[PDB]
Amino acid sequence: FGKRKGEGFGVDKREVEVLRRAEKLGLVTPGKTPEEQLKELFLQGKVVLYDGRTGEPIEGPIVVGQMFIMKLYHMVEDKMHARSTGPYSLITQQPLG
Amino acid sequence: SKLKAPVFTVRTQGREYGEFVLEPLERGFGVTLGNPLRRILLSSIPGTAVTSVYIEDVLHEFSTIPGVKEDVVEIILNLKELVVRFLNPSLQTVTLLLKAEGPKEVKARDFLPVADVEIMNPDLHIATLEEGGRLNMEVRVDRGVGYVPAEKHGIKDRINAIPVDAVFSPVRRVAFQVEDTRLGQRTDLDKLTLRIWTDGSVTPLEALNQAVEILREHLTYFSNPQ
Amino acid sequence: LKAPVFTVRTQGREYGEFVLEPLERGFGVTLGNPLRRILLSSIPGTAVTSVYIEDVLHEFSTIPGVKEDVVEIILNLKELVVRFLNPSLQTVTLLLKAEGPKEVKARDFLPVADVEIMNPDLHIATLEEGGRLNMEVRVDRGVGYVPAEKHGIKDRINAIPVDAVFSPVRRVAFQVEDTRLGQRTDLDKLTLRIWTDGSVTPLEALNQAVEILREHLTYFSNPQ
Amino acid sequence: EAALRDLDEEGVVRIGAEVKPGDILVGRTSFKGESEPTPEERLLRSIFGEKARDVKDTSLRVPPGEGGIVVRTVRLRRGDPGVELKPGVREVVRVYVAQKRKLQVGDKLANRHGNKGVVAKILPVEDMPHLPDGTPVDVILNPLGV
Amino acid sequence: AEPGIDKLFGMVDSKYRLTVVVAKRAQQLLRHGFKNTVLEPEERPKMQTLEGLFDDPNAVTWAMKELLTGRLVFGENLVPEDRLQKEMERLYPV
Amino acid sequence: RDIKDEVWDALEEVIHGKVVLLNRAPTLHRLGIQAFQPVLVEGQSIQLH
Amino acid sequence: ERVVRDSLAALYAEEDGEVAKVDGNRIVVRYEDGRLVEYPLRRFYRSNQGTALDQRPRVVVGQRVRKGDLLADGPASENGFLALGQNVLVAIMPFDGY
Amino acid sequence: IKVAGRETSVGRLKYVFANPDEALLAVAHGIVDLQDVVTVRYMGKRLETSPGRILFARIVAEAVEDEKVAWELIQLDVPQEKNSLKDLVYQAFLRLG
C-alpha cells in the first residue's frame, strides 16, 4: 500500500464500499483512515478482491495468500477409459476387466 | 443536467508502463469503462512469442546438449520469455538464428540481427556453455493473439522441430483505479485511472487504443437485429 | 471468426430478449456487464419527484375521507409513467382534484402540453363521500435513481419529496452460456433480458446504452 | 506408407517421432493358422489380383489414450553379443515414450493439510479474482472445506 | 425433466405401464420409418444439425410427444398380434 | 489422426435424445445409478450435476 | 533438506575443491586431493511409477565448493529442498459452483 | 426502535418502495443492501422484510411460473437454510410436480 499512496493514487472507491461492509462485520474499527482499516484487514490476512468479470469488488474482504500445493499422481489422462466391445474371458465369455 | 466529454490525461513511462486517466465521468462509469477494457487488454491484444525450435543434432524436447548446463526443457523454457517486436506491420513470421561456443553464457542478444526485429530484452539468459560446448538454434517467432499451446499448433520447420508454447499477448499486467471527483456542482463523480504494463512489442498506449478499437468494433454487432 | 448474429424476441412495448452469439471467449460478460450497468445508470426517463396534497403536512399522515394513507398514494404515484413528447420539455406540474365517492386514475390528471400518460388506468386513490382530494405533482426528466431525502426539491412549504424513479428500465438480467461453432468450443453466447415501463422500449433502451458506450470510446482522443 | 512414415528400415519408430493412438510403434509379422484363407476369403482375393498373403500384421500399436515422443529404443536380439533371452524368443524390442503433462481438468491437487481436490475449471486470467494492483490469483479454494 | 412427464404418469395406472407403451410405440416407429405417426408436420420433434433443423431421430422422444396428443390407444387384449404386425406393414411399408 | 472434424458433428446426431447412466462407487441404494442426457465436452473428466 | 539428502537423489560434494566442468550430462570437479572425480548425471530416468527421475546441475565452472555442498538437484528438489509442488497465490472464496 | 407505539426501524421509514423492482433498483444504486430491512408493497399487503427476502421470493415465483402459489410455499420472514429449502422442494413437489 505505501508503494501506492506515493505512486500517485489514493484509496479506491470500491475499497471503501467493502470497508463499509467490513465495519458491519466487525473486522475494522470504525472512524479510522482507510489505510488504518486496510492495515487492520491485512493483519487478519484479508484483502480486497475485485471480480474480474465485472470490476466490482467482492462484497467482502477475502483471505488471500501463498500456499504449497502438490500435483498428485492421479490424473484423468491415466484413468479415462471406455469400451464398446472388446476381449472376453475363456470360460465365461464375459468381458475382460 | 448531463456531464460532458472529460479530460484524457496520458502519463507514459518508458516503452513498458502507462497510466491513463479520465476526468470526470458519471458516478459508476469508473468500472463500466475500466473493466471491459482490462478484460480485452489481457486477452485479445496481438503480440509475439516464439513458436518452434530446431537445434542441430537434436530430435525431441527431452534431449540434452553437451557442454551446455541447460537441458533442452530449460532452454525451450528460457526462450518463452524472449519478446520480439516487429517493426514492419505486414511481417507475420521470422526465423531467428544463433551460434556460439567456448565458455560463453549465451544471452538473448547473441542472436543474429535481422531488420524489422528488435530484441526487447537483450540481457535475457539463454544457455551456459563451457569450454567445448557448441550451439545452433533456429527459433521461429510469430505475431498472434492470446495463448496457443504446443499441443495445439504443432509448428515444425525442420523435421526435429520442437513446437513451443506462445504467450502471444504483450500485456504483462492491467490494473485500474477509480477515485472520487467533482465538477464543482456535483459529488460522487468517478476518476478512472488505467494502469498498463507491457513487454515492448506493442506499448501501453497502443494496447489501450487497440483495446478500445475492439470494444467499439464489438458494439457494431448490435446493428442488425432479427 | 464469423459475423456474430443478433436476435431479437420482443413481446410488446415492455419486454424483449436479445441474443448475440457466437462471441470470442470471455466477451459475453465483457459486453452485457457494462450494458447492465448502463441500462440501469443512464437511461433518461421521467419520474414523480414532489407532491403536495391540500391539507397534508408530512408523509406519514392519514387523509380523512380517503381510504389510502399518504404513503400509499405516494407509492401509486411512484408507479406512474409518462413520456415527454417535446424533447425540449424538462419539467411539469400535474394537477388533479376530485372528491366524493370516486376512485381517481392517471387518466383523471389535468392534461398538459405534449405530456403523454402511458398508463391511464393506474389507480391513485379512492374517496368516500365527503373526501376531498386536491393535489399537485412534480414530474421531471432524469436518470437512474434518487432517494427523496437526497434531492430535496420543494416547490412550496408542505410539498413532500418522493423517491425519484427515473429509469424507464425495471431490471436488466443477462445470461452468458458456453456455445460452439464447428470445432471452436469456448465461445460466449449472450442472452440479455430487458424490462421497461413502456415510456421507452426494451429494444430502444439497449441501443441507447450501446450508443452511450461507444461515445466514451471517443473520450480517448486528445491527450495531455 | 503414411502409416509407416516414422519407422526405420527394421520396423522401429524413429527416436524423436510423435506417436498417437493407432500408430505402429514396432511392426511385426506372425504366420496365419489352419484358417489359412478359407473359401469366403480365397475368393475375395481372387478378384483383386493379390493372392492370400501368408504372414500377419501383429504390429505393436499404441493404446487408446496414450502416446507422446519416442525418446529411446532398445533392440535385443539373440545372436548379438552379451544377450540371451527366454527360450524360443528370437528378438525383443522396447520403445520408451514420453509426454509433457500440462495440468488439465481432472487432475488431483492437494496440500500438506489434507485439502485435496480435482481441478474442475480453468478460467482465463481476465476472470480470476485479483487484487487492486492488477495481480490475479492462481487458485480459488472454497472455504466450505475448512 | 422430461417434457410433460407429470401428465404422462397421470394417464397410466402404474408408472411402468407408461414405460412399455412408450417403448413399444417407440419401436413401431423405428421399424416403419415413422409413416404411421399420428403427428402433423409442425408438431414433429426436430433436432438442429450443423447444416439445418431436421426430424428428431430418437424414436422415444417421438413416442412420448406422440402419446400426449391422445391420438394413441393403450390397453391389454386389444388386437391379434399377427393382425397388427401386418395391417401396419400394409398401411405403411418397410 | 484419421478422425476428421465432421466425425464429431456426426456423433452429436447419434446421441440425440438418448441418455446414459452414471454409477458411483458404492451403489448403496436405488440411486447410485441415475439417467442423464450426455452433453459432449472436450477434456477427460465426467461432469456431475 | 535432510530428506533431499538421505533420499540419496540429489548429488553432493565429497571433499573441498573447485569445479572443473559442468554440463546437462556430467559434473567434473578437481579436488584439493588433486583427484578429478567425474559425477555423471542420471538424466531423464524412468521411475517405477513412470515419473521422470531427472537430475539437473546447480553449479557453474570454477565454482569454489566446500565439503557437503550441492552439485545437482534431484527430482522434486530445489537448491536442495524437498520441492513436492508449487507455491501459488490462493484465494479462499466460493466461486460460482466450480 | 419503538417509535410512537409499535416497534419498527429507521430503515422501514426512510425507504418505502411501491413494488419489488424499485426496491431492487435501489439496491443496484447503493441506496440499500440486501440484508437491510425496508418496506415494500408486494401483492397488496405492504410488508416489512428485506430486498434479499424479496429477491428470493421472486426467484421461486419466476422459476415455477406461478407467482400466487410461490407466495404461499416459502416462509419469507426467516433466513433460508437447509430445512426451509428442503421444505420448499417438498412443498413445491406436492403442488406443482
Short mmCIF file of C-alpha atoms in Angstrom, two decimals, chain C:
data_model
loop_
_atom_site.label_atom_id
_atom_site.label_comp_id
_atom_site.label_asym_id
_atom_site.label_seq_id
_atom_site.Cartn_x
_atom_site.Cartn_y
_atom_site.Cartn_z
CA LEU C 1 -14.28 -15.67 -36.94
CA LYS C 2 -17.78 -15.00 -38.34
CA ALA C 3 -20.19 -12.05 -38.07
CA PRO C 4 -21.97 -12.51 -34.69
CA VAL C 5 -25.64 -12.88 -35.44
CA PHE C 6 -28.01 -10.74 -33.38
CA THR C 7 -31.50 -11.98 -32.42
CA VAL C 8 -34.49 -10.13 -31.00
CA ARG C 9 -37.54 -11.63 -29.33
CA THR C 10 -39.82 -8.84 -28.13
CA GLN C 11 -43.30 -9.17 -26.68
CA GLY C 12 -44.76 -5.66 -26.58
CA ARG C 13 -43.64 -2.21 -25.50
CA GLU C 14 -42.06 -3.51 -22.26
CA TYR C 15 -40.08 -6.70 -22.82
CA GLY C 16 -37.60 -8.14 -25.24
CA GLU C 17 -34.68 -10.55 -25.03
CA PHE C 18 -31.65 -10.07 -27.23
CA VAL C 19 -29.32 -12.95 -28.03
CA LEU C 20 -25.95 -12.30 -29.64
CA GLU C 21 -23.77 -15.35 -30.48
CA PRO C 22 -21.18 -16.61 -31.11
CA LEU C 23 -18.55 -14.49 -29.35
CA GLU C 24 -14.88 -15.00 -28.55
CA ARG C 25 -14.09 -16.32 -25.06
CA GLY C 26 -14.87 -14.03 -22.12
CA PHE C 27 -16.73 -11.41 -24.14
CA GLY C 28 -20.38 -12.14 -23.40
CA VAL C 29 -19.57 -10.72 -19.97
CA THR C 30 -17.15 -8.10 -21.31
CA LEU C 31 -20.17 -6.68 -23.14
CA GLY C 32 -23.51 -7.00 -21.39
CA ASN C 33 -21.99 -6.47 -17.98
CA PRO C 34 -21.34 -2.83 -18.78
CA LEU C 35 -24.64 -2.76 -20.69
CA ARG C 36 -26.26 -3.88 -17.41
CA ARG C 37 -24.55 -1.00 -15.60
CA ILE C 38 -25.58 1.50 -18.26
CA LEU C 39 -29.13 0.25 -18.81
CA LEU C 40 -29.72 0.99 -15.12
CA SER C 41 -27.45 4.08 -14.63
CA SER C 42 -28.17 6.38 -17.51
CA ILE C 43 -31.40 5.66 -19.32
CA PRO C 44 -33.20 9.02 -19.33
CA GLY C 45 -36.82 8.73 -18.26
CA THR C 46 -39.41 10.63 -16.25
CA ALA C 47 -40.12 10.50 -12.53
CA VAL C 48 -42.53 11.83 -9.91
CA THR C 49 -40.28 13.95 -7.69
CA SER C 50 -42.51 16.03 -5.39
CA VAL C 51 -46.14 16.03 -4.25
CA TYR C 52 -48.47 18.45 -2.42
CA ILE C 53 -51.94 17.50 -1.12
CA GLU C 54 -54.25 20.17 0.07
CA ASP C 55 -54.37 19.51 3.84
CA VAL C 56 -51.38 17.19 4.30
CA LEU C 57 -48.42 18.23 6.44
CA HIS C 58 -45.97 15.25 6.36
CA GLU C 59 -45.76 11.88 4.58
CA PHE C 60 -46.89 9.72 7.49
CA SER C 61 -50.42 11.01 7.94
CA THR C 62 -53.98 9.94 7.17
CA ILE C 63 -56.19 11.84 4.72
CA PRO C 64 -59.75 11.97 6.11
CA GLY C 65 -62.47 10.72 3.80
CA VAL C 66 -59.85 8.79 1.86
CA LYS C 67 -59.13 5.04 2.12
CA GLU C 68 -55.40 5.12 1.36
CA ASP C 69 -52.88 6.68 3.69
CA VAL C 70 -50.45 9.27 2.40
CA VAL C 71 -47.59 6.85 1.74
CA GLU C 72 -49.87 4.51 -0.20
CA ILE C 73 -50.68 7.36 -2.58
CA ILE C 74 -47.04 8.40 -2.82
CA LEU C 75 -46.38 4.78 -3.82
CA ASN C 76 -49.04 4.65 -6.54
CA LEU C 77 -47.51 7.90 -7.76
CA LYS C 78 -44.08 6.27 -7.80
CA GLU C 79 -45.52 3.90 -10.41
CA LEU C 80 -46.96 6.43 -12.88
CA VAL C 81 -45.21 6.50 -16.28
CA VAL C 82 -45.31 9.44 -18.72
CA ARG C 83 -43.29 10.30 -21.80
CA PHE C 84 -42.27 13.85 -22.68
CA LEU C 85 -43.13 14.29 -26.35
CA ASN C 86 -41.43 17.68 -26.82
CA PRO C 87 -37.70 16.92 -26.45
CA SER C 88 -37.10 20.36 -25.03
CA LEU C 89 -39.58 19.83 -22.16
CA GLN C 90 -37.87 19.14 -18.84
CA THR C 91 -40.41 19.64 -16.02
CA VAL C 92 -44.18 19.56 -15.42
CA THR C 93 -46.70 20.00 -12.61
CA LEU C 94 -49.71 17.71 -12.84
CA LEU C 95 -52.94 18.92 -11.36
CA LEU C 96 -55.72 16.74 -10.05
CA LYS C 97 -58.74 17.50 -7.93
CA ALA C 98 -61.81 15.36 -7.33
CA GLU C 99 -63.86 14.36 -4.31
CA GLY C 100 -66.91 12.44 -3.12
CA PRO C 101 -67.31 8.68 -3.79
CA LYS C 102 -64.89 8.00 -6.64
CA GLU C 103 -61.53 6.39 -7.34
CA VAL C 104 -59.04 8.58 -9.22
CA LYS C 105 -57.00 7.31 -12.16
CA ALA C 106 -53.99 8.59 -14.06
CA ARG C 107 -56.45 9.45 -16.85
CA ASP C 108 -58.03 11.92 -14.34
CA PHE C 109 -54.85 14.03 -14.37
CA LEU C 110 -55.31 17.52 -15.84
CA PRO C 111 -53.92 17.08 -19.39
CA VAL C 112 -50.82 19.00 -20.39
CA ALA C 113 -48.87 20.05 -23.45
CA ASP C 114 -47.08 17.07 -25.03
CA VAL C 115 -47.34 15.07 -21.75
CA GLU C 116 -48.49 11.51 -22.56
CA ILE C 117 -49.78 9.42 -19.65
CA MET C 118 -48.82 5.90 -20.78
CA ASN C 119 -50.73 4.01 -18.16
CA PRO C 120 -54.06 5.82 -17.77
CA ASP C 121 -55.97 3.14 -15.82
CA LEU C 122 -53.40 3.02 -12.98
CA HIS C 123 -55.33 3.78 -9.78
CA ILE C 124 -54.27 6.65 -7.47
CA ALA C 125 -56.73 6.61 -4.58
CA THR C 126 -60.34 6.09 -3.52
CA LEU C 127 -62.55 8.70 -1.88
CA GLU C 128 -65.54 8.36 0.40
CA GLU C 129 -68.33 10.94 0.10
CA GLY C 130 -67.04 13.98 1.94
CA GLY C 131 -63.49 13.14 0.90
CA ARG C 132 -61.55 15.92 -0.77
CA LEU C 133 -58.60 15.04 -3.00
CA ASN C 134 -56.67 18.05 -4.31
CA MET C 135 -53.04 17.66 -5.35
CA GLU C 136 -50.12 18.78 -7.49
CA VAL C 137 -47.28 16.54 -8.59
CA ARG C 138 -43.84 17.45 -9.97
CA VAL C 139 -42.50 15.28 -12.80
CA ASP C 140 -39.03 15.63 -14.29
CA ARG C 141 -36.58 14.31 -16.87
CA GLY C 142 -33.70 12.36 -15.36
CA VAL C 143 -31.70 9.19 -14.99
CA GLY C 144 -31.01 6.45 -12.51
CA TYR C 145 -32.47 6.62 -9.06
CA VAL C 146 -32.52 9.19 -6.31
CA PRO C 147 -33.92 8.82 -2.77
CA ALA C 148 -36.38 11.55 -1.71
CA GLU C 149 -34.25 12.53 1.28
CA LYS C 150 -31.44 13.21 -1.26
CA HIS C 151 -32.68 15.69 -3.90
CA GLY C 152 -35.00 17.60 -1.53
CA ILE C 153 -36.86 19.62 -4.13
CA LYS C 154 -39.67 21.64 -2.54
CA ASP C 155 -41.84 23.93 -4.67
CA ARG C 156 -43.66 25.10 -1.55
CA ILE C 157 -43.70 24.56 2.20
CA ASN C 158 -45.50 21.21 2.86
CA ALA C 159 -44.79 19.71 -0.55
CA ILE C 160 -43.34 16.24 0.08
CA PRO C 161 -40.32 14.85 -1.80
CA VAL C 162 -40.82 11.36 -3.27
CA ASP C 163 -38.06 8.89 -4.15
CA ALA C 164 -37.13 9.60 -7.77
CA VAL C 165 -37.70 6.61 -10.09
CA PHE C 166 -36.33 7.90 -13.36
CA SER C 167 -35.04 4.81 -15.16
CA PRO C 168 -37.64 3.53 -17.61
CA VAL C 169 -35.67 0.23 -17.12
CA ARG C 170 -37.07 -2.05 -14.37
CA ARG C 171 -34.48 -4.81 -14.47
CA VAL C 172 -31.58 -5.90 -16.57
CA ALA C 173 -30.86 -9.64 -16.47
CA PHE C 174 -28.12 -11.09 -18.69
CA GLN C 175 -27.03 -14.71 -19.01
CA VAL C 176 -23.82 -15.78 -20.79
CA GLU C 177 -23.59 -19.52 -21.56
CA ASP C 178 -20.96 -21.59 -23.43
CA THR C 179 -21.55 -22.38 -27.11
CA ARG C 180 -19.66 -23.87 -30.06
CA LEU C 181 -19.32 -23.30 -33.83
CA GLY C 182 -17.78 -26.24 -35.70
CA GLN C 183 -14.64 -27.16 -33.77
CA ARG C 184 -14.13 -23.88 -31.85
CA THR C 185 -15.89 -24.56 -28.49
CA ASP C 186 -15.36 -21.93 -25.86
CA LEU C 187 -17.42 -19.16 -27.40
CA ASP C 188 -19.77 -16.95 -25.44
CA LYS C 189 -23.46 -16.83 -26.28
CA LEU C 190 -25.01 -13.74 -24.70
CA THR C 191 -28.68 -13.64 -23.81
CA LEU C 192 -29.85 -10.29 -22.42
CA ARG C 193 -33.26 -9.57 -20.92
CA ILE C 194 -34.66 -6.04 -20.52
CA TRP C 195 -37.81 -4.90 -18.73
CA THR C 196 -39.13 -1.34 -19.20
CA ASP C 197 -42.25 0.69 -18.26
CA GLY C 198 -43.39 1.45 -21.84
CA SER C 199 -42.04 5.01 -21.58
CA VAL C 200 -39.15 3.72 -23.66
CA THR C 201 -38.89 0.22 -25.13
CA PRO C 202 -36.61 -2.74 -24.42
CA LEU C 203 -35.12 -2.61 -27.90
CA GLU C 204 -34.81 1.18 -27.64
CA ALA C 205 -33.30 1.23 -24.13
CA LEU C 206 -30.47 -1.05 -25.28
CA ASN C 207 -29.48 0.81 -28.45
CA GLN C 208 -29.13 3.91 -26.27
CA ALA C 209 -26.98 2.06 -23.75
CA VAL C 210 -24.94 0.79 -26.72
CA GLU C 211 -24.78 4.37 -28.04
CA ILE C 212 -23.57 5.81 -24.75
CA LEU C 213 -20.88 3.15 -24.75
CA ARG C 214 -19.09 3.96 -28.00
CA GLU C 215 -19.40 7.62 -27.03
CA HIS C 216 -17.00 7.06 -24.12
CA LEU C 217 -14.68 5.13 -26.51
CA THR C 218 -14.17 8.56 -28.12
CA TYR C 219 -13.02 10.02 -24.77
CA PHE C 220 -9.63 8.56 -25.61
CA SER C 221 -8.76 11.29 -28.18
CA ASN C 222 -6.98 14.47 -27.01
CA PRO C 223 -4.19 13.55 -24.59
CA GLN C 224 -2.09 15.56 -22.12
#
